[PDB]
Design a protein around this motif. Structure first.
Motif, PDB file in Angstrom:
ATOM      1  N   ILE A  26       0.865  -1.221   0.000  1.00 48.79           N
ATOM      2  CA  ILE A  26       0.000   0.000   0.000  1.00 48.79           C
ATOM      3  C   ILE A  26       0.886   1.251   0.000  1.00 48.79           C
ATOM      4  O   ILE A  26       0.659   2.186  -0.746  1.00 48.79           O
ATOM      5  CB  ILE A  26      -0.821  -0.080   1.296  1.00 48.79           C
ATOM      6  CG1 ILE A  26      -1.763  -1.288   1.234  1.00 48.79           C
ATOM      7  CG2 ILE A  26      -1.649   1.199   1.463  1.00 48.79           C
ATOM      8  CD1 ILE A  26      -2.337  -1.568   2.625  1.00 48.79           C
ATOM      9  N   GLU A  27       1.898   1.261   0.836  1.00 48.21           N
ATOM     10  CA  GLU A  27       2.827   2.436   0.909  1.00 48.21           C
ATOM     11  C   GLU A  27       3.524   2.662  -0.443  1.00 48.21           C
ATOM     12  O   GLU A  27       3.708   3.787  -0.869  1.00 48.21           O
ATOM     13  CB  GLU A  27       3.858   2.067   1.982  1.00 48.21           C
ATOM     14  CG  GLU A  27       3.301   2.408   3.369  1.00 48.21           C
ATOM     15  CD  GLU A  27       4.265   1.904   4.448  1.00 48.21           C
ATOM     16  OE1 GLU A  27       5.221   2.605   4.736  1.00 48.21           O
ATOM     17  OE2 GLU A  27       4.028   0.827   4.970  1.00 48.21           O
ATOM     18  N   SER A  28       3.907   1.601  -1.121  1.00 46.82           N
ATOM     19  CA  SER A  28       4.586   1.751  -2.447  1.00 46.82           C
ATOM     20  C   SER A  28       3.613   2.331  -3.484  1.00 46.82           C
ATOM     21  O   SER A  28       3.983   3.171  -4.283  1.00 46.82           O
ATOM     22  CB  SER A  28       5.028   0.339  -2.845  1.00 46.82           C
ATOM     23  OG  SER A  28       3.915  -0.546  -2.797  1.00 46.82           O
ATOM     24  N   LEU A  29       2.370   1.899  -3.469  1.00 50.19           N
ATOM     25  CA  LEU A  29       1.369   2.437  -4.449  1.00 50.19           C
ATOM     26  C   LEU A  29       1.147   3.938  -4.201  1.00 50.19           C
ATOM     27  O   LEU A  29       0.958   4.704  -5.126  1.00 50.19           O
ATOM     28  CB  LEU A  29       0.073   1.657  -4.188  1.00 50.19           C
ATOM     29  CG  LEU A  29       0.168   0.264  -4.817  1.00 50.19           C
ATOM     30  CD1 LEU A  29      -0.947  -0.625  -4.260  1.00 50.19           C
ATOM     31  CD2 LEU A  29       0.016   0.374  -6.338  1.00 50.19           C
ATOM     32  N   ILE A  30       1.183   4.355  -2.957  1.00 55.87           N
ATOM     33  CA  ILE A  30       0.989   5.807  -2.630  1.00 55.87           C
ATOM     34  C   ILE A  30       2.195   6.619  -3.128  1.00 55.87           C
ATOM     35  O   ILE A  30       2.041   7.688  -3.687  1.00 55.87           O
ATOM     36  CB  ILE A  30       0.885   5.873  -1.096  1.00 55.87           C
ATOM     37  CG1 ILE A  30      -0.447   5.258  -0.641  1.00 55.87           C
ATOM     38  CG2 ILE A  30       0.953   7.327  -0.624  1.00 55.87           C
ATOM     39  CD1 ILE A  30      -0.355   4.859   0.834  1.00 55.87           C
ATOM     40  N   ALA A  31       3.391   6.112  -2.930  1.00 55.99           N
ATOM     41  CA  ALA A  31       4.612   6.845  -3.392  1.00 55.99           C
ATOM     42  C   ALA A  31       4.691   6.843  -4.926  1.00 55.99           C
ATOM     43  O   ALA A  31       4.542   5.781  -5.512  1.00 55.99           O
ATOM     44  CB  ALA A  31       5.793   6.078  -2.788  1.00 55.99           C
TER      45      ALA A  31
END
Length: 17
Positions: A12-17
């Motif tokens: 999830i954090e990678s998709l946001i960045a």
């Protein structure tokens, strides 16, 4: 599949960045 919740937090954090 989906062994720990930490793996999902990293996907999830990678998709946001």
């Amino acid at each position: 599949k989906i062994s720990s919740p930490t793996e999902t937090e990293r996907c999830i954090e990678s998709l946001i960045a």
